[PDB]
Amino acid sequence: MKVTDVRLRKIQTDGRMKALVSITLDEAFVIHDLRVIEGNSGLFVAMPSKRTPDGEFRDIAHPINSDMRQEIQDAVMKVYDETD
Amino acid sequence: MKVTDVRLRKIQTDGRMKALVSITLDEAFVIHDLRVIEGNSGLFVAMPSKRTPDGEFRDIAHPINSDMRQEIQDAVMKVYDETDEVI
């Protein structure tokens, strides 16, 4: 439920991919390969994702509700603004 | 952190990989692509693995304490052992 740790490195880029991010949940489980993505519509945190059995991408890790999604974004963005 | 939901699909191809698995943690986060794997000393649960562009693999998500590791192994194997193909 709680994001207890956030690790990221900012990439030097004109690319939209701005950082690779790892997060820890409740000091018990880490998820790698989150991304901070910038575009003209705003910054967001993408979950790690992969191409499925055939064709499409989906999140390998996925918060179930909006509240959890916003909490991850905020936790990650705070550290992101603190970085460099 | 409780593993509250487990969703399993038995893989038909008789190899190392016995099932593909999703779990829910705390009813707050779902992790896809756990794998039931036959290792040298029995079946176990492997973590979500992603192929890198050059054909290597990255372990994407994993436990960092023994309680979490054991709860995932236990909750997943429980559901696997309920499948029709296991006796």
Tab-separated table of C-alpha atoms in Angstrom:
chain	number	residue	atom	x	y	z
A	1	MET	CA	0.000	0.000	0.000
A	2	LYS	CA	2.806	2.437	0.866
A	3	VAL	CA	5.723	3.317	-1.405
A	4	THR	CA	8.593	3.031	1.049
A	5	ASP	CA	11.443	3.683	-1.363
A	6	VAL	CA	12.099	5.271	-4.763
A	7	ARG	CA	15.295	4.923	-6.764
A	8	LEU	CA	15.856	6.679	-10.079
A	9	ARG	CA	18.500	7.946	-12.486
A	10	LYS	CA	17.802	10.954	-14.735
A	11	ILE	CA	18.840	10.449	-18.369
A	12	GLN	CA	20.557	13.265	-20.348
A	13	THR	CA	18.194	13.409	-23.321
A	14	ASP	CA	16.043	15.371	-25.733
A	15	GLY	CA	13.995	12.150	-25.614
A	16	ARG	CA	10.687	11.925	-23.794
A	17	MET	CA	11.977	9.109	-21.581
A	18	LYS	CA	13.391	11.066	-18.657
A	19	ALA	CA	14.298	8.461	-16.019
A	20	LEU	CA	14.362	4.776	-15.125
A	21	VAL	CA	12.792	4.158	-11.700
A	22	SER	CA	12.519	1.397	-9.088
A	23	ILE	CA	10.001	1.469	-6.264
A	24	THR	CA	9.600	-0.535	-3.033
A	25	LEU	CA	6.193	-1.465	-1.560
A	26	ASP	CA	5.930	-1.861	2.214
A	27	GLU	CA	9.669	-2.624	2.559
A	28	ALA	CA	8.851	-6.091	1.109
A	29	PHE	CA	8.624	-6.005	-2.691
A	30	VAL	CA	10.525	-4.007	-5.320
A	31	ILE	CA	9.411	-3.213	-8.857
A	32	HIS	CA	11.945	-2.143	-11.470
A	33	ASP	CA	11.681	-0.558	-14.873
A	34	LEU	CA	9.208	2.222	-14.194
A	35	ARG	CA	9.790	5.320	-16.345
A	36	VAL	CA	9.306	9.080	-16.006
A	37	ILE	CA	7.970	10.206	-19.379
A	38	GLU	CA	7.755	13.901	-20.373
A	39	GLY	CA	5.650	15.299	-23.200
A	40	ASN	CA	3.793	18.535	-23.867
A	41	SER	CA	0.704	17.137	-22.071
A	42	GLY	CA	2.743	16.586	-18.871
A	43	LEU	CA	5.035	14.199	-16.998
A	44	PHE	CA	3.899	10.705	-16.099
A	45	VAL	CA	5.190	7.492	-14.539
A	46	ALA	CA	4.833	4.443	-16.772
A	47	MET	CA	4.700	0.977	-15.225
A	48	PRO	CA	7.060	-1.648	-16.589
A	49	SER	CA	5.451	-3.310	-19.604
A	50	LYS	CA	6.014	-5.988	-22.211
A	51	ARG	CA	4.639	-7.398	-25.465
A	52	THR	CA	2.173	-10.212	-24.658
A	53	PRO	CA	1.612	-13.724	-26.306
A	54	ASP	CA	0.985	-11.835	-29.565
A	55	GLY	CA	0.965	-8.135	-30.445
A	56	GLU	CA	0.150	-5.716	-27.644
A	57	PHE	CA	1.887	-4.163	-24.642
A	58	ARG	CA	0.540	-4.204	-21.144
A	59	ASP	CA	1.867	-3.380	-17.696
A	60	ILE	CA	3.686	-6.248	-16.012
A	61	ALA	CA	2.964	-4.484	-12.702
A	62	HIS	CA	-0.243	-2.556	-12.215
A	63	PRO	CA	-1.859	-0.559	-9.384
A	64	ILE	CA	-5.535	-1.592	-9.270
A	65	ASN	CA	-7.133	1.730	-8.392
A	66	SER	CA	-6.637	5.451	-9.199
A	67	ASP	CA	-5.658	6.287	-5.640
A	68	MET	CA	-2.683	3.886	-5.764
A	69	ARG	CA	-1.721	5.160	-9.227
A	70	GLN	CA	-1.645	8.810	-8.045
A	71	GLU	CA	0.331	7.819	-4.941
A	72	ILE	CA	3.050	6.171	-7.088
A	73	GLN	CA	3.166	9.158	-9.422
A	74	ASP	CA	3.487	11.607	-6.519
A	75	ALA	CA	6.118	9.477	-4.699
A	76	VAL	CA	8.212	9.220	-7.879
A	77	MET	CA	7.755	12.831	-8.994
A	78	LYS	CA	8.884	14.141	-5.572
A	79	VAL	CA	12.208	12.301	-5.924
A	80	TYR	CA	12.450	13.268	-9.574
A	81	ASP	CA	12.113	16.982	-8.734
A	82	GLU	CA	14.771	16.377	-6.019
A	83	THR	CA	17.220	14.804	-8.476
A	84	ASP	CA	20.230	16.334	-10.316
B	1	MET	CA	1.606	-7.638	2.476
B	2	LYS	CA	-0.919	-10.346	1.657
B	3	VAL	CA	-1.243	-12.204	-1.652
B	4	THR	CA	-5.011	-11.926	-1.890
B	5	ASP	CA	-5.716	-13.019	-5.427
B	6	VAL	CA	-3.962	-15.551	-7.657
B	7	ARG	CA	-4.791	-16.151	-11.296
B	8	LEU	CA	-3.153	-19.016	-13.059
B	9	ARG	CA	-2.976	-20.473	-16.568
B	10	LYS	CA	-1.359	-23.911	-16.988
B	11	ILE	CA	1.087	-24.039	-19.881
B	12	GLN	CA	0.415	-26.976	-22.184
B	13	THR	CA	3.960	-27.213	-23.579
B	14	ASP	CA	5.748	-29.936	-21.609
B	15	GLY	CA	8.907	-28.015	-20.683
B	16	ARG	CA	10.240	-26.168	-17.617
B	17	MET	CA	7.347	-23.666	-17.580
B	18	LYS	CA	4.258	-25.146	-15.952
B	19	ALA	CA	2.059	-22.025	-15.577
B	20	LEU	CA	1.844	-18.280	-16.123
B	21	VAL	CA	0.642	-16.442	-13.016
B	22	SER	CA	-0.832	-13.110	-11.826
B	23	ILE	CA	-1.050	-12.164	-8.156
B	24	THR	CA	-2.537	-9.237	-6.272
B	25	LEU	CA	-0.693	-7.668	-3.324
B	26	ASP	CA	-2.664	-5.862	-0.546
B	27	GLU	CA	-5.600	-5.618	-2.988
B	28	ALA	CA	-3.530	-2.579	-4.153
B	29	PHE	CA	-1.117	-3.856	-6.860
B	30	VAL	CA	-1.263	-6.662	-9.449
B	31	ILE	CA	1.867	-8.362	-10.762
B	32	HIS	CA	1.599	-10.354	-14.005
B	33	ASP	CA	3.952	-12.901	-15.558
B	34	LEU	CA	5.116	-14.905	-12.561
B	35	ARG	CA	6.036	-18.370	-13.781
B	36	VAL	CA	5.606	-21.800	-12.239
B	37	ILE	CA	8.904	-23.465	-13.080
B	38	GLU	CA	10.082	-27.058	-12.610
B	39	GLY	CA	13.552	-26.756	-11.147
B	40	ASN	CA	15.961	-29.460	-10.087
B	41	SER	CA	14.407	-30.070	-6.664
B	42	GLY	CA	10.699	-29.467	-7.420
B	43	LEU	CA	8.328	-26.755	-8.628
B	44	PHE	CA	8.817	-23.115	-7.644
B	45	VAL	CA	7.580	-19.625	-8.539
B	46	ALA	CA	9.827	-17.483	-10.736
B	47	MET	CA	9.494	-13.703	-11.023
B	48	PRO	CA	8.394	-11.558	-13.996
B	49	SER	CA	11.122	-11.656	-16.597
B	50	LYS	CA	11.541	-9.312	-19.556
B	51	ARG	CA	13.719	-9.914	-22.620
B	52	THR	CA	16.136	-7.030	-23.277
B	53	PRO	CA	16.546	-5.813	-26.932
B	54	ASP	CA	19.755	-7.880	-27.162
B	55	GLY	CA	18.203	-11.121	-25.878
B	56	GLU	CA	19.196	-10.986	-22.235
B	57	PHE	CA	16.644	-11.072	-19.392
B	58	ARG	CA	15.716	-8.628	-16.638
B	59	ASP	CA	13.968	-9.757	-13.419
B	60	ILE	CA	11.427	-6.920	-13.108
B	61	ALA	CA	9.814	-7.463	-9.703
B	62	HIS	CA	10.858	-9.501	-6.669
B	63	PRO	CA	10.509	-9.879	-2.875
B	64	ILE	CA	13.154	-8.347	-0.577
B	65	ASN	CA	12.230	-10.153	2.641
B	66	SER	CA	11.636	-13.781	3.567
B	67	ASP	CA	7.985	-13.386	4.607
B	68	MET	CA	7.096	-11.830	1.233
B	69	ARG	CA	9.036	-14.509	-0.686
B	70	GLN	CA	7.374	-17.342	1.259
B	71	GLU	CA	3.852	-15.884	0.979
B	72	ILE	CA	4.166	-15.615	-2.828
B	73	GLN	CA	5.594	-19.154	-3.192
B	74	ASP	CA	2.917	-20.500	-0.820
B	75	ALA	CA	-0.099	-18.671	-2.238
B	76	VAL	CA	0.839	-19.504	-5.817
B	77	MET	CA	1.704	-23.181	-5.337
B	78	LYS	CA	-1.560	-23.640	-3.402
B	79	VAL	CA	-3.569	-22.545	-6.480
B	80	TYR	CA	-1.349	-24.533	-8.862
B	81	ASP	CA	-1.899	-27.707	-6.822
B	82	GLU	CA	-5.684	-27.193	-7.187
B	83	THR	CA	-5.456	-27.515	-11.015
B	84	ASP	CA	-6.911	-30.648	-12.654
B	85	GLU	CA	-3.596	-31.856	-14.087
B	86	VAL	CA	-2.000	-32.312	-10.612
B	87	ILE	CA	-2.927	-35.416	-8.616
